[PDB]
C-alpha cells in the first residue's frame, strides 16, 4: 500500500498559481519544550515553497531519446489476461510462455507533468493532456488483436475489454498515448476515435486512477522502481520546490533531465485489488482543493525522501552527512573534482534512494538496480556539462539535503536510512511527541565568575536542537552563547562570512526560510568548548539573571510536537536566503587527513 | 449553579462601546458593633471584543492533542459502524482517536457571541463558509480510497438518533476546517453539497447547547476533559471581553485569546440543564455565569510567594526600563509564575467542570504555551508596560460560588480570596495581629503587623460609611517600612488606597509592606467622631451578599485607579532575595 497521510490536503489552498513570479508556501509549526523546565520553549516555522517553473513547461518538445525498458514482460496471470484478448481460434492454440513486453514510463512522466500542472493551476482539459496532438491522431483499426503482429512498429495496444470494463482509463491512456509519439491500436471506433466530454473533476479522477493503474502495471512486471522514478521525474518536471539550501537541488535537476522513449505494449484489464488502499479518502469528481492537496503532499514527500535517505560518511567512527570538499578553485560555475566526489557519493545514494522511493509508494524495490543506474546516468548528464550550474559554484557542498523532512511523514520507520539513526533526518514526527536529546554528550568542565563552560563533541548543529529554542527567543537567546575557549575559530560551513573578512548569533545561517538547521551547517570534527552567560554583572556592581537555560536543561531532553500546517502567500522573510561560506578551510584539511 | 441566572437583563449589546454591568451588593458588618456597617457594590463589565470577533480567521496552527483513545464500548460502536459500511473495515482494528478542541473553541466563541449580541444563523456558526464546503461521501468513494485517521467522520446513526447534534457538529466542522466525511449525501442540489433545514435561533441554541456538553462528555470519556473545557472557556473569553477589576492585569484574557488548535478529527458515536428551547435570558444567564465563574476561578487559583515564611500573592518585579511597552525580565518571571499557575488553574478548572484531569497535565502545557506566545511576541502590549505587577487577579471571586470547598486553592488558605460567599454569611478577621501602641490627644496609635490591605478588610467599611471616609485614619511612616503598589504619587489612608471605582473591594496585594506599620486613628476633632472603638478594630467582620442586579454602563466605574508602578526599594529587596538568596531579607 502507498502512504498518503493527508498533511497538505488539510492546508486548504485558495489561490491559483498562474505565473513564475509568485509561489505557494506551506508552513508548519514545531513546538520545542525542554523536559527539565517548560519555560524553555519555542516555535520553529518550517516553510516549504512551490513554484511553477514555466507557463508552458508541460508543452515541451518530446525528443524520444532516453531510458528505455525493453525487457518488462508480464507474469503468468496477466499473460492469461492477454491471451484472453485474442480470437477464440487463436486463444485456443497459443503458447503459454509468450511474453508481451510493455513500456509506459513516458506516459507516466507526462501524466506526472499534467498532474503537477493541475496542482499548480486549476486548468486541465484534453488540450493539456495530449500536447495539442489529439487533433490529428490516426489510430489504426484491427479486430481481436491477432492482427497486432501485422504492425511493424511496437504498438500501444488498447483493447476493447479495457474500454468495456471502465471507459475513463481507456480514454486517459488514449490521451497519454496521443501525448507521446506512440502508435495506438484499438479494436472498434463507432476514422478518428471520439471520447465523451469530461469536466475536469472526472478527468482528474481518471488521471489519478490511471496513475495507479500504470504503477500496478509496472509493479506486476517487477519494474516498479522505474515507474515511481518516472512519476517523480514527471512531478518535478513542471513544478519547482524551491530549495531550502542554495547548495542543494542537483537531485531536482537530475529528475528534470530524465526522459523516456516511445511507449508500447498491451494494456490488460487490471486484477481486482492490486493495491489494498491508498490510506486517504478520495472520491469521484473531487474538487481542485483535495486533489491538489493530496498530490502536493506526494510532491513534497518525494522531495523530502532525498534528505530522509542518504548515505552518511563515517569520519573517525562518528557518522556525518556527506560533505564534499574540493581543492581546485571554481571556474565559471563548474567544478570537475566536486563532480567526481558527488558521483562517488551518488553511486551509493541512488540505491537507497530508489529503495526508499519504492518503500514510500506501494511498490516493492527491485533488488536488481535499474532505476538507480538510470538516475546515476541522469546525474552524469547534469554534471560534466558546458552550461554554468548555480548548484556547483562552491568548494564545499552537502548534496542530499534539498528540503526538510521533519514534520512531513506520519511514520518514518519503514524507510531505511543510516542518517536517521545517526541523529539527523526526522526532527519531529507528525501526530506524536518525539523526545530526543537536547545537546551532544558533554562534560561540565567549569564555571567562571559570570560564565559556564561545557565541552561538546559537536557532531553538527542538527544534533543540538536546543539552539533552535535559543534561536527564536527575541532577546538573550544566542547573544549570550559565545566561542572563545577554543584556540582556533575554524568551522566547516561557516555561518556568515560577510562579518569577518564572537557569539553564536554572529556566525549562524539566516535560516529565515526554515528555522531548523541544515544537517551540515556549522559542522566540526573536533571537540568544542562552549560557554554560556548566565548572569550579567554591571559596571556599578550589581548583577542580574539573564534568560539563559540552566545546567539541568542541557542534559534534559527536548520534547518536539507538531502544530498545524497551513498555506500562505510569499513574503520577504522566506525569500531571504543565508550567505554561506563554501571554501577550503582548516577543518577541510582535517577532513582530508581524517579516517573517512 | 444559578447565582447570575435568577438576575434578569433585557439589554442587547450590538457594539463594542456598550457593556453589561453585573452588580453585587455586599454588606460588611462588624461582629462586636452592629451599627458600623457598609454596602459595597462590585461591578463586572462584559462587552464585545469586536463585532467580527466570532469571524476571526481560523489558522489551523495550534495545540495538537494525541493519544485521545475511546473506551471499549465506544470502540465497539465505532467498529460496528466501520464493519457496516464498505471501505471502512480496515480502520476497525486500530485504536481510534478524537480531537474536537477547535470545534469546542468555536462553540464557546459562538455561544459567547449569542449571549452577548443575540443573533445566530448559519453564516455566524460556520464563519459564512458552509455554502461552499464539499462533503466527501463514503458511498461515492473510490475502491482505492480508505477512510483515514484524520478525517472527521459523522455517522448516519448519529443523524438517526439525534439530527440536531449531527447537524451542529457538521456546522462546527465547517467552521473549523476539516475533512467532513458522511455516509451518503442526498444529491438534491449539489453532488456533494449538504443542504440543511432552517432553524429558528431557539432550537439552534438548544441544539448547540446540547452538542457542547455532548463533546465535553465525549472528551471526558476519552480522558482529556480538562483540555476540552479549557478550549471551551478559551472561546468564551475569546469573544466576550470581561473588563478586569485591577487595571492592566488581564494577561490571562490575552493568553486565552492566543490559544488555537489543530484541525478537528475523529468519529462521533451515539452517546452512552434545560429541556425546552429556552429564551435568550436564561441561556445568556447560565453562560454568563460560566464566563464569570472562570473569571473568578483565575483569581481563586493563585500560587503564593513565601517571604520570610509568610504567604503573599504572586507579585512580580523587574528593574529594566520598558521598551515598546514590554519587559522581557518581567515576562520571564511571568512565565515561571505561569508554569505554577497553569498546573493549579487546570486542576481548578477540572474541579469546576466536574471532569477529572489527566495525570500528565498536557492541558496546562497548552495553556503555558499560550502564555509563551503572548509573552514572547512583539506587539505594543498595554499589560506589560509596567515594572511591578500582581498578574493572577483578573476578576474578584467574591459571591460567585455556593461553596469554595472543592476548589484546591493555596491562596485561600491564607486570608486572600473571596470575601463573601453567596447565600451564606462569612465571618473573618477585621485586622491583623495587633498591639496597642498608645493613645494621645485626639489620636490613637495601633501597631499593625502589616501584610496587605485584603487581610485588613475593615477599612472599606470606613471608606463606605457616610461623612468622612478614611480621612481620619493615617500612618506613621518609619524609614524601614516602604510601600509597594501605592495609591497616588502625591498622609491620610485615602491617599494610599487606589480608590478603585470598578469594585469597592481591595486588590490582592493592594498595599504590601513586609514589616509592621503604625496606624493612628483620629477619635476626636478639636468634638467626637464616628471612629470605631478598640473592640470593633480587634473584633471580627461578617460578610454577606445581598442580590445581584444587572445594569448598563456607568461612567463612575469606567475610571481605572492609579497604582504608580515603578522600580522601588521593595523591588530591590525582592531582587536581592531572588539572586543572592533568601537570607538577605531576613
Author numbering:
A (entry chain A): 15 to 204, 210 to 520, 541 to 635
B (entry chain B): 19 to 290, 300 to 517, 541 to 576, 583 to 642
Could you give the paper's own sentences about this structure?
The species of Leishmania carrying Leishmania RNA virus 1 (LRV1), from the family Totiviridae, are more likely to cause severe disease and are less sensitive to treatment than those that do not contain the virus. LRVs belong to the family Totiviridae of viruses with linear double-stranded RNA (dsRNA) genomes. Totiviruses have nonenveloped, spherical capsids with icosahedral symmetry formed by 120 copies of a capsid protein assembled in asymmetric dimers. To protect viral RNAs from degradation, capsid proteins of the L-A totivirus cleave the 5′ caps of host mRNAs, creating decoys to overload the cellular RNA quality control system.
The structure of the virus-like particle of LRV1 was determined to a resolution of 3.65 Å using cryo-electron microscopy and single-particle reconstruction. The capsid is spherical in shape, with an outer diameter of 424 Å. The particle is built from 120 copies of capsid protein organized with icosahedral symmetry. The two capsid proteins forming the icosahedral asymmetric unit of LRV1 differ in their structures, despite being identical in their amino acid sequences. The structure of subunit A could be built for residues 15 to 204, 210 to 520, and 541 to 635 out of 742, whereas that of subunit B was determined for residues 19 to 290, 300 to 517, 541 to 576, and 583 to 642. The two subunits have a similar distribution of secondary structure elements and can be divided into the α-domain, which is formed by α-helices 1 to 13 and 16, and the β-domain, which contains β-strands A-L and α-helices 14 and 15. Structural differences between A and B subunits in the LRV1 capsid, which reflect their nonequivalent interactions with the remainder of the capsid, are located primarily at protein-protein interfaces. The largest interface in the LRV1 capsid between subunits A and B has a buried surface area of 2,000 Å2, whereas the remaining interfaces are smaller than 1,200 Å2. The capsids of LRV1 contain pores with a diameter of 10 Å along the 5-fold axes. The surface of the LRV1 capsid is negatively charged except for the positively charged cleft in each capsid protein.
